[PDB]
Symmetry: D2
Subunit: 512 residues, 4 copies
């Protein structure tokens, strides 16, 4: 039997992975023993990125194997064209039920449904082609129903379960637990769904997308996770001397430094993200780590079931996140812009049976578009023609292919959506609000469609504080990176039908 468990957490940064911290002789300041098991048994990818943010775009890339340039689900609230083949439909093509827990944050194609469809009132709903066995549901109704049915009385505004405990609590970064017990947390919910699904399968081959919401905000944790980590033990946020000097690097930086609000990160909180002080940021980070360890605890329950039923060694397990989180870096909160911490994400893969490269940490450059092709390759399917990504399976056996990519790529589109509208500030039209990034071990280039470009020397400036793009002494380098990214664009134009040929012998296909 072959099973696939695709664990997709939300908003979990690549530098919050203990196996890699320990590899580099850093303090592993959070605990994730179950993720650590996967790392010991599998391959940990240390230069993995999501190809776009935030959740909608990122999950479109993950679940289609396409760049944002191809999928066009460019922001939350923007439709995903039905024409793209997604992992759910592809899994049906190899005889697998595409069972899904969590959410995909997918807006339907308006050509396919009524303009009155309630799916158009929310950020996104379930992507067509999956089989939902544990949905969050829009407005988290699935979760809240489950809490209510478990007999826990909810407040009148149900997200107020995430206010810190106590009538006197000040909303924001907090050393108080949330107002929801651990047993009724969202992470418990998703886990119970997983266990229910796996028990229903009763040994039959499975695919399961196991989605967790955490550590997405609000940054508040059920007891005792809220108190598990000390703020002084957390890595310091990396940021310029003040928000104004930060914002000076680029107009998009300025937009987000100015506009991000604390209430988008802590339930009920007032004020700007940028004005959080170091102590507050450290508490936030400790809470974030609490959330992370709550997921890991829950994963241990899923893993225990696989072990007890003798399915662990038959399961390909992929752990990843949809995207990262600034976590105060550069005066930002969230997953926006162009900085590494918004895009870099974990990826750990444990093959079936004893893995050839168990415990290895891979520096080859991998992108979230690669995960769908990997899964399909593993299950013996054809990788669709149209995918931009490649299978990672060679990494599990012999290593990085000679001809593998030599740069990481990602994209961000910041056109106006109902809750964040930078266009007027920036002076831009809707189709001119994007950027792409290309990077390697040495240099990072950020190319904006209609704003200035950025270029960082990552050996000297690993935290991206010193734009060099407009320095004449760097002209040849910036040229070279603009040129690599331009080649990337041309190599990734849509491939739907481009292998077909008419000719004297009729319709054919080209394979090379």
């Amino acid at each position: 039997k072959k099973n696939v468990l695709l664990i997709v957490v939300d908003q979990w940064r690549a530098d919050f992975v203990p196996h890699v911290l320990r590899a580099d002789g850093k303090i592993d300041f959070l605990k994730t023993p179950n993720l650590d098991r996967l790392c010991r048994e599998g391959v940990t990818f240390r230069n993995h990125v999501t190809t776009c943010v935030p959740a909608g775009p990122a999950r479109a890339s993950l679940l289609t194997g396409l760049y944002l340039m191809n999928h066009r689900a460019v922001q939350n609230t923007v439709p995903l064209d039905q024409r793209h083949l997604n992992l759910g439909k592809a899994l049906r093509g190899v005889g697998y039920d595409p069972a899904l827990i969590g959410y995909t944050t997918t807006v339907p194609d308006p050509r396919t449904t009524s303009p009155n469809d309630p799916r158009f009132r929310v950020l996104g709903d379930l992507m067509d082609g999956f089989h939902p066995v544990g949905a969050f549901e829009p407005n988290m109704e699935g979760y809240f129903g489950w809490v209510a049915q478990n007999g826990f009385d909810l407040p009148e505004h149900r997200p107020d379960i995430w206010l810190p405990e106590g009538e006197d609590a000040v909303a924001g970064a907090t050393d108080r637990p949330s107002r929801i017990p651990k047993e009724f947390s969202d992470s418990t919910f998703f886990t119970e769904r997983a266990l229910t699904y796996l028990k229903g399968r009763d040994g039959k081959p499975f695919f399961l997308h196991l989605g967790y919401y955490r550590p997405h905000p609000p940054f508040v944790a059920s007891a005792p996770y809220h108190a598990m980590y000390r703020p002084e033990d957390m890595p310091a946020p990396i940021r310029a001397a003040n928000p104004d000097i930060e914002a000076a690097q680029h107009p998009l930086m300025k937009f987000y430094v100015d506009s991000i609000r604390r209430g988008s990160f802590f339930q009920g909180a007032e004020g700007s993200g940028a004005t959080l002080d170091e102590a507050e940021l450290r508490q936030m980070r400790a809470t974030y780590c609490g959330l992370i360890t709550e997921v890991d605890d829950c994963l241990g329950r899923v893993f225990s079931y696989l072990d007890e039923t003798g399915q662990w060694d038959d399961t390909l397990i992929i752990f990843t996140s949809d995207h990262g989180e600034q976590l105060g870096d550069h005066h930002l909160l969230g997953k926006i812009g162009y900085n590494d911490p918004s895009f870099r994400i974990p990826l750990v893969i444990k093959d079936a049976g004893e893995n050839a490269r168990a415990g290895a940490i891979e520096s080859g450059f991998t992108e979230s578009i690669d995960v769908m092709p990997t899964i399909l390759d593993w299950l013996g399917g054809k990788i669709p023609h149209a995918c931009d990504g490649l299978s990672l399976l060679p990494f599990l056996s012999e290593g990085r292919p000679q001809d593998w990519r030599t740069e990481l790529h990602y994209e961000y589109d910041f056109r106006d959506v109902y809750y964040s509208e930078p266009q007027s500030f920036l002076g831009l039209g809707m189709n001119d609000c994007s950027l792409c990034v290309i990077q390697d071990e040495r240099y990072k280039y950020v190319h904006f469609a209609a704003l200035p470009p950025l270029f960082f020397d990552l050996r000297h400036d690993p935290n991206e504080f010193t734009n060099l793009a407009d320095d004449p002494a760097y002209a040849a380098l910036v040229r070279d990176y603009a040129q690599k990214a331009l080649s990337w664009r041309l190599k990734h134009a849509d491939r739907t039908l481009t292998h077909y040929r008419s000719g004297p012998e009729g319709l054919s296909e080209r394979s090379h």
Copy 2:
């Protein structure tokens, strides 16, 4: 606020409705206090039929408002063409989430998905366009997972929970409970799903299809429902002197009398349905009533939640079944052929607020195709052009429209499917294995595509034992009924585009 609760039970006969029994001065030999509440508050339809059987075809009609002649999902295991507009998609068109609990038994259109799709391994899966919030799942995996997660240990073959209690139990009609406790029954499962969904909604307007599996077989009940009714208190089965004399009426009757097996009705049972004796049939009926009262008990929990939250008077509640059940009538078990008990089904409708016709029992002839138009009319939508059914709303206020139908209609297709293959016995090709029925208070005509027709005088022969179709003295009557059914065929040809017109002023539509 306007809500819709569409309760769809499975295999529940119209003559197992206490309100109607009492109206006709019969003993109401089963208890259904919650259904009785709906009857007291709403309109009970006493001449309602499903337009086809079994579950797949019936639910296609229910959920599209189409005859089988139009929907073509002619048997279980036969695809439903994606072109038909179903209630789920139509509900999205009026801004409602099409939440569904239970199942639809729908085989996908092969033009829309891979031939490898696991949905093609089972009878049917969920119909496209619904939002599942409590699926049985193929092979009842949803249920069995929920049982397992609740900590109940299941047997190795999970349907063996429906063997009668005790190692010594003889499989078949039984006075022993099943091996599943009430708290872990399927009806409990669907109810918990309903309550979870409604609690998640938290007062917001809803549509919910609340599906129950019971009283579908196996005819075994959790304690103490197995013992709730005495076999001597049940209505006697209505059948000919012996199976051979029964089978003589028609070749299709003979097919089913000969082939139906007890193991399709009682878990693990051996032998033919037809050879059950009167005592066995009475026990089966008592068990069936047990199952029915277990549903009604569960409905009381859903209704209690609506009452406690003040939503009862804002909810249109429709109770119906997908089809009926022979229950030993005519030596048959199941939902097959042409007899009234396979097609006649409950229908009770309680409008929002104090109903103008509360407690009324309606004799107007209504068909399951009418339910979708009723729901959409009630929610202020347009009834799609293509529907064969009409809205029932006039019945809730002034009564039967002057121009309402004056005959009931239904259809059955018996072409070969993997578990029941009458073609070779009958001598027929696949496109020649159907019948249609037309009836009124006086006469019933059964027209077969390629076998002999049947005609019953229902005043003299209410139980359809004496075919008159080949009696010359009935030629004018049979003529008249063949002619009504033929007019019916012509009046119901597909209406997808037939209202459109080209002409000098361009494209238009005709409304009358």
Copy 3:
């Protein structure tokens, strides 16, 4: 090489076929030597019918192999659903270019094109999937352009080329030629298109739909065709003693007797069709025969090219009409209602090489739905599942299959269209304005959806003057015919997906 020439004339009656007239010892009062060649070399079908009228519906049946009950292009100006597979697309499936001359009178599916599409201003345009190589074009623009480019000056209203010659001419049935020379006639036009297409092919395998407009009205002929036949030599029209006694048979008869206008049949004419006298009707018939012989002359040019290039013996030639013409019968002009002369049409088929049944006249009952399956069978394709018709090829070799149909069937829908609106007169809604007909050598039954039925004894009443349906002594017969037609309905329900099955081994198909 295998070629197919499908010649489709318009409005040509089956009883205007000399080979059959001579077979029955009648005077062959018109000349058609080229059609007579096909008859001598092939099989002439004497009981062929179009399954519906007028041109749009008839050509939908011809070009899809579907009954009107399935195709739903129920009247002129009503869309043809894109879902039906037509002969053009099927021909592409066997590697043939679906070249077409003439017209198909097809209204596009509004779901496929803008509501502003100019194709919605006319009766119909070209059916999707054909390759036009000689279109009439809407409003006959293709023709009129060709005339103008040939240097003939057209009148200001271009159809006035069909006024009889002379300023003093009275419009109507005429012994004067039209105002267009033979060399610039429509039949010359289509022929020149054919020859141009065949010369372009230069021996390569072809399919060609060679459409002629004639003998469709206006009943006026280029010289000397207008004078070729004497009115006294024509068959007398068959009609009741006066229009009122005619109209009494049925309300639909009354509608058409009352409403048909002469200007729909003769350019510029005033007055009712019904009031034409016997002399006028005889002239009309002589003109009609003139038109027919002009087509036959033109066919001789196409046939001469096939002969000179050695392709005759490699070509399957099918000659047929879209429908017939009342030609004064029953006080009617046109193709309407239920009478034999509107539906009965020629069919002659000459196979490649020396035909086994050369010169034979076939009485087996054949329908226009059979022609598409015949063509595809001949070219080695699969007959689509969805076709209602069957291949005629067995008739060319061994004869009528044992299991061939034993009745002829056709349909007419008379719902309101911009130029003919019987609904208010009849008292009917749009979906209640149809009939179907079933007949054999002895009896004819006409079943109306919502009007009275008709039944004729064809041995005693070959011209359908004496309705017997309401005669009690005929109850068993009418019963029997209503019953055959009802079986026909059930046997012909849509077959798109009904051969597919889910089951344990996955998706399969049933072949029998």
Copy 4:
């Protein structure tokens, strides 16, 4: 009334436009009095380019308003995805019949038709959505049929009409006429189709795509066009000292210099294009000019009809070409690679009525993608969201918009097709065989996906002989152009659905 005549010639270079030659004080060495009329009455665009070559890709751009990056019809023989809205369908959306003469060289989408479709045996057939009124047809069957029907006897291999006259003629560049009389030329054919269509319209509003094949090769002309121009009077070809020094600039240059054959340009000719001597090249150019003047003569007939019927002042006339022709430049023949002469094309536009800018010559940078939006804007339609081009109408009135593009762009894909397969030579995979170009008055940058880039200083090196891209002193410039092209890529990502938004008020659209 508003009419549109879109004249699309084939293979006509921008520097073969007399009005522009005379404007720049050059000898106008060819005569085109009818094109000159349009120039005197309208606006001549002197910096117009096709966005890709050869014919298939170019006509996809022209007829969709999309870059090659979006349409993906990347080479001849590669399918055009049905999802793109083309001008034919858009014209139906404004109530215009999309009449077309010539050809579109469009390979159908294989998801839409059988793999056996004969349209897959040729380079391309007619694009879906047009109404053909004068097709060349695959293999020019339409033309050759018309010749044959006109009574001209064709040779056994019909393209041998383009061998030079005389049994002794050497195939290649020639001072002999072709073997087809002027009256039976292809340009006469298209013209007769136009006149036939316009006469059929009889004053009603029209759209007509009037396609000419000439001056596409074979470079041989009917008498006396073959002798109309002296070889010594032609502009000299611009090329390096020898083919090897030419080929050294870039591997793609080398491919084409090496592989192009004379038989692709002159009927029956042997040998390489590159080895033609100056005299031969001059003759070729004189023949090419002959072909051009034959088109112009034919246009005068169409224009005469518009004048005689009083429609000239009601017609928007757009004259353009699908692409250019190297004509010996850079040792090349054809439309390949990256040089200006393959991409630069005429564009002249005469508005209805007396034009505000009659006689003006516009230097604003315009691209073939702009033509569809112009036509639709002119006819009062919405420009589709998805178009990459913009309407040119502002140029006809006030001039170049302030915010108009400041660079020209084009693309070439050279992946393997049946007749030209550079991949193995180049060492490339199929999705790595493309380039894009960006240019302005001063500099030209050619960016290859997987080969070296090129950069020209057009003031010093107008004929693109000196690549500077690898010169360090040009690093900042090449950077700047790579960066403009990269911004171009990002600004032109697919726009199908990217204006839609979900949100609290339901589905909406963003306009800015």
